């Protein structure tokens, strides 16, 4: 089997991407944030505290003939940005782009934090990291990809995020028409539950590539690119008027600036992030100061190859017995 679904930016900055997911019988279609940095599939629902729902489409398990309550099960998650959610647990039939998993754990939110309530476009998350991070208790549950794996033509999914445009998540096959040149594969460590890999270095604009190991995670659920302070300083030093602002919360630059590209290494291959991808717009409405898309990971505890980096590539998440990551230009 295979599946193929279009993923769409939620706003004009590509702050996140949503992908339609069919849950239950008859299908209830919710738009979920596919997140390769977490491992819970959770949804706004008929059980979510009413005052914490603001425009989202909700899953109503009592209207699904295939929903089953996982007796006594609970879940509770906190994300790197400080957001959180919690609730109880159902299993139900879940389909993504034609690919169906029966008995998928669907985590129903009873409570969500303000940042989720305030985002009317995101009806929940679909986690695609390793199932060892799943937060269901007393028994951890498997991700959609883990459940689907044995049925897939090949044990892979791919992320092909668009810049200010729709993209694609594919399951079970590599679309050889979706990238230029070849895919370079690189080792993954699953020790922390993430798609964790080591980049071979970086370049700023037309600068000579610096060979240096940068351990980080491929995380479709994080907007920006977070890298060591040394690397990030070297980047913004090439932008006139750029500075790190403690009040804004990161590097900012004059909106009139021409941003250099940023290159990261994948083995001996190179992925080039165009300068425009690094522009996340006015720091507030009407401001002539803009927020940068490359920020320091200092304080996070890990480097994160988020959407800013991933949308510059066709990315293979290879869930073979020994997982790997593949990157191609496109």
From Swiss-Prot:
Molecular function GO terms recorded: aspartic-type endopeptidase activity
Keyword Translocase found: no
Annotated disulfide bonds: 255-290
Reaction catalysis annotation: Hydrolysis of proteins with specificity similar to that of pepsin A, prefers hydrophobic residues at P1 and P1', but does not cleave 14-Ala-|-Leu-15 in the B chain of insulin or Z-Glu-Tyr. Clots milk
UniProt domain Peptidase A1: residue ranges: 17-328
Enzyme Commission identifier(s): 3.4.23.22
Record flagged with keyword Transferase: no
Example GO biological process: proteolysis
Catalytic residues (UniProt): 35, 199
Keyword terms, alphabetized: Aspartyl protease, Disulfide bond, Hydrolase, Protease, Signal, Zymogen
Family designation: Belongs to the peptidase A1 family.
Listed name of the protein: Endothiapepsin
Organism whose genome encodes this protein: Cryphonectria parasitica
Gene: EAPA
């Amino acid at each position: 089997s295979t599946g193929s679904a279009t993923t769409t930016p939620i706003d004009s900055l590509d702050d996140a991407y949503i992908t339609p997911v069919q849950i239950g019988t008859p299908a209830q279609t919710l738009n979920l944030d596919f997140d390769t940095g977490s491992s819970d599939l959770w949804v706004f629902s008929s059980e979510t505290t009413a005052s914490e729902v603001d425009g989202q489409t909700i899953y109503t398990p009592s209207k699904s003939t295939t929903a089953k309550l996982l007796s006594g099960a609970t879940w509770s998650i906190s994300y790197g940005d400080g957001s959180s959610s919690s609730g109880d647990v159902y299993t139900d039939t879940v389909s993504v782009g034609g690919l169906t998993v029966t008995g998928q754990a669907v985590e129903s939110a009873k409570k969500v934090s303000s940042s989720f309530t305030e985002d009317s476009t995101i009806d929940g998350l679909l986690g695609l990291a390793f199932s060892t991070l799943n937060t269901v208790s007393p028994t951890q549950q498997k991700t959609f990809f883990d459940n689907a794996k044995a049925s897939l033509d090949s044990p892979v999914f791919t992320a092909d995020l668009g810049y200010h445009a729709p993209g694609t998540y594919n399951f079970g096959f590599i679309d050889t028409t979706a990238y230029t040149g070849s895919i370079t594969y690189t080792a993954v460590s699953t020790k922390q539950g993430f798609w964790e890999w080591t980049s071979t270095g970086y370049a700023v604009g037309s600068g000579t590539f610096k060979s240096t190991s940068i351990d980080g995670i491929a995380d479709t659920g994080t907007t920006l690119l977070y890298l060591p302070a040394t690397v990030v300083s070297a980047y913004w030093a090439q932008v006139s008027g750029a500075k790190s602002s403690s009040s804004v919360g990161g590097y900012v630059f004059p909106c009139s600036a021409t941003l250099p590209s940023f290159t990261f290494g994948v083995g001996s291959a190179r992925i080039v992030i165009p300068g425009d991808y690094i522009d996340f717009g006015p720091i507030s409405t009407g401001s002539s100061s803009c927020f940068g898309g490359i920020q320091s990971s200092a304080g996070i505890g890990i480097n994160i190859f988020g959407d800013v980096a991933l949308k510059a590539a066709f990315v293979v998440f290879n869930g073979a017995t020994t997982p790997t990551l593949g990157f191609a230009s496109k």
